[PDB]
Uridylate-specific endoribonuclease (Severe acute respiratory syndrome coronavirus 2), 1725 residues
Amino acid sequence: MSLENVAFNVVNKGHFDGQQGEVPVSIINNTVYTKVDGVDVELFENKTTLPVNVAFELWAKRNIKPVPEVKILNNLGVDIAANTVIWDYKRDAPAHISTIGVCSMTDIAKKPTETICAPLTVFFDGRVDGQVDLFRNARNGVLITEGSVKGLQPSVGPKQASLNGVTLIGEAVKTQFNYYKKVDGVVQQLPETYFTQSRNLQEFKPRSQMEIDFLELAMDEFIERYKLEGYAFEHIVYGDFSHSQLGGLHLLIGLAKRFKESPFELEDFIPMDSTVKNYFITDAQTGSSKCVCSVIDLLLDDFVEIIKSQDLSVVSKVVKVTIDYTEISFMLWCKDGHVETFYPK
Amino acid sequence: MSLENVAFNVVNKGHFDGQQGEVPVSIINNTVYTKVDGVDVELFENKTTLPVNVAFELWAKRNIKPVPEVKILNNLGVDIAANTVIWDYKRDAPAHISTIGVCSMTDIAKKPTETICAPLTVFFDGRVDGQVDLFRNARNGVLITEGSVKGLQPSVGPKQASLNGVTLIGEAVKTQFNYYKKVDGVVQQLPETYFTQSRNLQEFKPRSQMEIDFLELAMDEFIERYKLEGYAFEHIVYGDFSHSQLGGLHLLIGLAKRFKESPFELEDFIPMDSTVKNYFITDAQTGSSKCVCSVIDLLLDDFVEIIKSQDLSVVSKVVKVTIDYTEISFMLWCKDGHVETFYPK
Amino acid sequence: MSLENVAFNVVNKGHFDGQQGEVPVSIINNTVYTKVDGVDVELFENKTTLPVNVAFELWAKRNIKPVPEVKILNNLGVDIAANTVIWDYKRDAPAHISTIGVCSMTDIAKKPTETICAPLTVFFDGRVDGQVDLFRNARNGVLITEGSVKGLQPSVGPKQASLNGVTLIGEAVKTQFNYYKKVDGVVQQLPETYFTQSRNLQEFKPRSQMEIDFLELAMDEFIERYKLEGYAFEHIVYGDFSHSQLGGLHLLIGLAKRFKESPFELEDFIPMDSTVKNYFITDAQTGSSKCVCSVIDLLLDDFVEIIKSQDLSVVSKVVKVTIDYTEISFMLWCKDGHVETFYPK
Amino acid sequence: MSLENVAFNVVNKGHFDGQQGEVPVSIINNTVYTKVDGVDVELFENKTTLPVNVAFELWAKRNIKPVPEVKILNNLGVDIAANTVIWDYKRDAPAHISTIGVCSMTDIAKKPTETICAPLTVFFDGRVDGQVDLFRNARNGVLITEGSVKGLQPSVGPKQASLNGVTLIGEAVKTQFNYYKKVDGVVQQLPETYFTQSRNLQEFKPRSQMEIDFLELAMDEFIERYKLEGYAFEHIVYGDFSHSQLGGLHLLIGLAKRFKESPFELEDFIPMDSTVKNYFITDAQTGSSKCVCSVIDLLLDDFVEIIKSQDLSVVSKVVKVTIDYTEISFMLWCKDGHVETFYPK
Amino acid sequence: MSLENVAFNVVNKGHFDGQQGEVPVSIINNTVYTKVDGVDVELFENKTTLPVNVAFELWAKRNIKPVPEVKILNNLGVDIAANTVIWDYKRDAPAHISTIGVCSMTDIAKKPTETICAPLTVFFDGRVDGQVDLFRNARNGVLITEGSVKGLQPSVGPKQASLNGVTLIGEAVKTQFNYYKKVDGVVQQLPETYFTQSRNLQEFKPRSQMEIDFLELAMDEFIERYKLEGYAFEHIVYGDFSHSQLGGLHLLIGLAKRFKESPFELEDFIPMDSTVKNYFITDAQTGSSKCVCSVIDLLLDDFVEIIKSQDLSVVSKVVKVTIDYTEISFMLWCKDGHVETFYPK
Ligand SMILES: O=c1ccn([C@@H]2O[C@H](COP(=O)(O)O)[C@@H](O)[C@H]2O)c(=O)[nH]1
Ligand SMILES: O=c1ccn([C@@H]2O[C@H](COP(=O)(O)O)[C@@H](O)[C@H]2O)c(=O)[nH]1
Ligand SMILES: O=c1ccn([C@@H]2O[C@H](COP(=O)(O)O)[C@@H](O)[C@H]2O)c(=O)[nH]1
Ligand SMILES: O=c1ccn([C@@H]2O[C@H](COP(=O)(O)O)[C@@H](O)[C@H]2O)c(=O)[nH]1
Ligand SMILES: O=c1ccn([C@@H]2O[C@H](COP(=O)(O)O)[C@@H](O)[C@H]2O)c(=O)[nH]1
């Protein structure tokens, strides 16, 4: 292993591919350059808190197959990955602080069977040879596979996965994984869970007829068709832009509908991958704004199921919803048997 | 006050909100990070010339209500703000070098009544309690209010204001201010003035029928309808792209019309907020370019009034137009009683 | 806890003392400044690989009582300290990567009784209340005390200790500790050991009559008086400067004698605290030099005991000597029953 | 003015001398280089908080004649210098944040007669032509001269001054100045004052017979000869190294006597020029140490006068002594009519 | 070749030694670290203008045998070295900008026989096999050897050379070289030359009886013994400290004599190796100072020969003296047949 060999692979293979060779490398400030035909070409700018030459090596060795989105791994308590780097593209940094068998500066072990790895919840990838059996022996672990594992009940994960920073539902490649988890040598039954949909504002695409209806129909028409009167969708989902403080607007599909008609600014003041996102939102059309607007991307059909499964008889309470394998707390406010607002915290 | 408490407020409230608490903070190079669930998340990248921890505190304490655009405050001679930070989003830096009662590293005073503040033109905000009366006592000051001030004649400011970096005409919030100014204890009569419209190229929206006509009609049709023959609109407003040096094109609406049909590059080589902007422009379609193209965004109706109020009998002269409370100099070139060009300097 | 409060303590108490207060702080590049009467004064320059604000906090909280030299702790396998920072003054950095109950960015636990601390060999300091009993309960640990511990046999440590970076034999303060060690809940019997003396070239002071004799007597006289003929002291201790490659010179006292008569340069190319030190040495008088000259500071009486306890009948072999609780390997070369050279590796 | 012209003067004249010319300059990180015969030579490393090219210009234009030590100017309330830079060699930075007529980035005025300079206490140097008369007209100012000023009573300053960072009593050049001060146009009578002597530990030289006696005589002999029994010189001046906490040792001459016999470490944790200095002291011989040891360098004859002019009848009190034109507070502790300790704060 | 292999050699061999291996390396800012037993140890701090990883490689590959001082190579017009790095310890940087066969980022050729090397004056080292014959074939070159070269007349170089930054007259190693030079394929006759002695102030040691006499005798006694009256040694060599501007003092031995009696400060404002050095000198005893004091270190016997070989009949003139193979210009000032001053420029 060598910095110059890593650069050679990046230049010739697009990432670290284990090829032999070296190229000349310059490091100046926080950027790595290589000399290409007499001129310097930037290969990598370190945006991490690691040393530039270390971040470069971890970046070059990132996993380039579809992998679980980082929010899923965090929610499952994954501490470290077995013999790979999960690159966190939202943070432009490794998803995990340490490595196993990846890099001499960051390795805590060469193999996940060493004792130092035993207390950590290690992520194992059943697509790599041998890792399923390592999971059967590991004390703490999470395993994904594309198919069945003998003697283990799977929990079916989300349909989408991350490929080189692109979140997608795979058609030429499988992105739908079974999930398994062990704690202290004991296989866990992962809970029934909803999954977030991981869409974004500018390219929001509906994924069900109900979501199509939400984008196509007027507000009162949609709530009428699906008999959603009294659940405060006008506030919660569509948003209330009538006052200086922006009311509601907590579901991504609701932001998408407003955005497609009228633009607004979202300051992502904690920029990481998480099931619930908090934005400093400023509506450009009205001047309505809100410092902390919590936003979750559930499939609209799923959100309706959740809200229709709540008792509306109490002024305020916390509602727990298992999402992405974690319990998300929602604030439910009601008045006279109707929803006033309902937002994730 | 404390760096870690500022970070706590940013993480939990989107900005500094006076809440008690602390979170762990890392500073590496010119970026501030906080540790969130075992990983570092970037909270702020310093693009200012202040120390990173100082810029972070001023940024977190920026004013998040609608405030006058920085170009107005500069034109009014404002030196410093009373108990707030005006963040200059065009420069990504504070609009003013010093503060009053904001930050221990940058404070020159805790209250604007101290003698050190007397010679400075201090900006007071009548929406904050007590500040109107501070203005009545201050030696040098500018005061904005949303309504009347007893015994003071107001100057009506622009319709738009800046909210979290978004320039807008408020509908749910008031952005139209009265302006007052004192110099050496004496209230000034602010001059009659036009106002720039603060629009941008990509999202340019007409704001009058004349501007609608400009975008909808052909060049000769528009000049004919409003009887503008001989005022060189073909050159000044529409632009002349026939030669290697780009001719004219000095009004934003004229750039907008060309841009909507044909893209071009504008290098903003002095990136700050100012009434007149200078761009290094390169027309992609023709290759016509100009190193310094001065561009002003007046409402088209206002620009027509201005140019029709000039004598066209002289080869060249400087025309003074009060705009944004400042005197803008225009170059007027005429030949045989017609305009040849007319551009701001 | 807060950066500004740490700076307040540094300015007012010389280190972190738990006092309430704050001062204004600036961070620019890798240096921390505070404003003192209108000007900036540097408080700390980060020479560590930690973030500047983190290194500053660990530095301010360094232990300022006599503590074991870092080489002893390393040799004893200490991984982390209980509720203190051992500052490594040779590296100008913390001696240990993590902390317990010191600093939010670096803490792995608030108390050493947490499970995450169990596999680490934690250093406990019996001078601090409660820590002896924590040692009795800890799974892995090293404990120093100034006196007896009930039911535990002590190993008497070196006479000297480090106080604010000053290695000294205490007269007004106790620097002589008893040592105890536990591995997996079992108290260890620490081995019989020599100790290095931790002296330096420029201020080398003899500590026994034999060392006095070495500095005072001529080479042949000293070897004769203590009947050291055939042990190659002429080479090993005095040094051989007759060839382009410097021969021998492996004991600090031998460097001291040459240095007091004739100066030379020692490049400390791995600058850390360790029992054996390696120097790139250049003799200024002769031009004799050697890239790797291993140097150990044993009391001369101790080194004579060691070398007189070796068999000299073999051409070459590795000799193991327990020093500072670790086994130091020496290379022993002999010819015709006499030493040729003998140096630590 | 130009960066490259400044570098030309530095290379050819040792400082800025107003010569015409330019040399090639490179700025990389915080260091300025120039190319000299094909290689880069470092000219200046910025240790200030100013921009590297700005600090370089102020450094090159530093005053290279004898000037008052910075501690005197600070004590006199000087805010800024007229047409010069006082370089603060203890901080390796300008003594004053702003300049007058020195540097375009830092100038607040070109001449001290401008209104912006009126509220500042401006330092004027009577050796420069015209500055005495500027002082007669300035509202706030301090003036030094080498001789009489018509109609103004002088206060005789210290014998020593700073020349290129060297504090000296001039023999070939005059370092003894008259001082004058104006506040709001009114000449002040500067108070009777002692002066500190500005000596250092390693090169401490006695400057009176009493100081000679202190270094030459034994402790009891000296106190006896000058009849100083009961004034706790044994504690205050000689120092008490018998306990873990170092007792007393508050006069530089007392540190000098110990240091000449036995070395110790002084951590200067607030590194600036000031009348009273605070050190984190560790005595190497005994291990006695103290986190905050306040140290003042008075001429011993002066300190005896001060302490013999105090009432010793009270347990504890604050004693005010005018020194370097400022009031220094001393803590006086007495028991049964004798001094227990007496130290500056 | 590889960064990590270079670090391995540095850690294990003190410099680059061609050994196989790798160690983990971190680069942060301008410093290279390696992890040694769980902690980071600084290996190299870049003070050059090259990229940190490039400077590190050139530093590790520096020549560690005695080599000509850089001032000699510069004076001989050497542009580049054949298959080695001459490290310039005065500048802490490579003596030459480019390399031949050393480092991929800096190499301009792998062998000096390539056409790109033909116009450069390449330094060849006859101690390395094959390089003498390369010199016979090179178009432009300088060759040093320890002995005779067939068919070439040598010029005997200085007695001293640089070994790892230590300038010395070798006793165990040869530092006295023959010099040869070729320009456009033609061997040059190097001129008769004096050599500077390369001594320093603090450790100045006389090297002849005349120099011994200078240090031992009083000023008038020495000038009398060697009949030097009228050559202004009182001014030129001893220095004149009677006025605010320091007079004379242009020979290092003269600085040494003053320094041994009385200290002064020398600011080396162009820090590089050169035959003539310019210092900003401040005399601590008198306050006499001079911004540009040119200082040359000739053996006193040599300087007397030079000055006694000048005509003293003219007010002022430039005197050319071949020194270190270059022509040094001296200013000679005379009055009434005696020297007034005589200093190098
Ligand atoms: O985690 C949070 C906290 C607040 N809010 C929004 O901020 C306001 C909180 O009001 P209050 O409960 O502080 O009165 C509401 O508009 C709510 O939608 C969120 O979206 N998420
Ligand atoms: O402040 C300026 C200066 C120049 N120009 C443009 O640059 C050219 C100036 O020509 P001249 O007056 O230098 O000949 C014209 O095309 C004019 O529109 C501007 O827009 N603004
Ligand atoms: O760890 C080491 C390795 C080598 N040397 C010195 O370097 C030389 C090693 O020679 P060799 O055994 O490589 O032939 C000897 O002078 C020896 O003293 C040391 O001091 N320490
Ligand atoms: O400004 C200060 C404060 C304390 N000390 C020293 O620190 C100790 C203060 O003790 P106490 O008054 O806090 O008990 C004494 O040894 C005293 O000499 C100083 O020198 N200067
Ligand atoms: O290259 C130089 C230039 C000047 N000086 C010194 O500076 C002064 C130059 O005076 P002047 O010839 O500028 O009058 C003299 O003291 C002279 O010794 C040098 O040493 N070297």
Notes: DSSP finds nine helices and 21 strands in chain B. The first helix of chain B runs from residue 3 to 13. The pocket of uridine-5'-monophosphate (ligand 5) is lined by residues E 290, 292-294, 343, 345 (CB under 6 Å). Chain B touches chain A through 32 residues (CB under 8 Å).
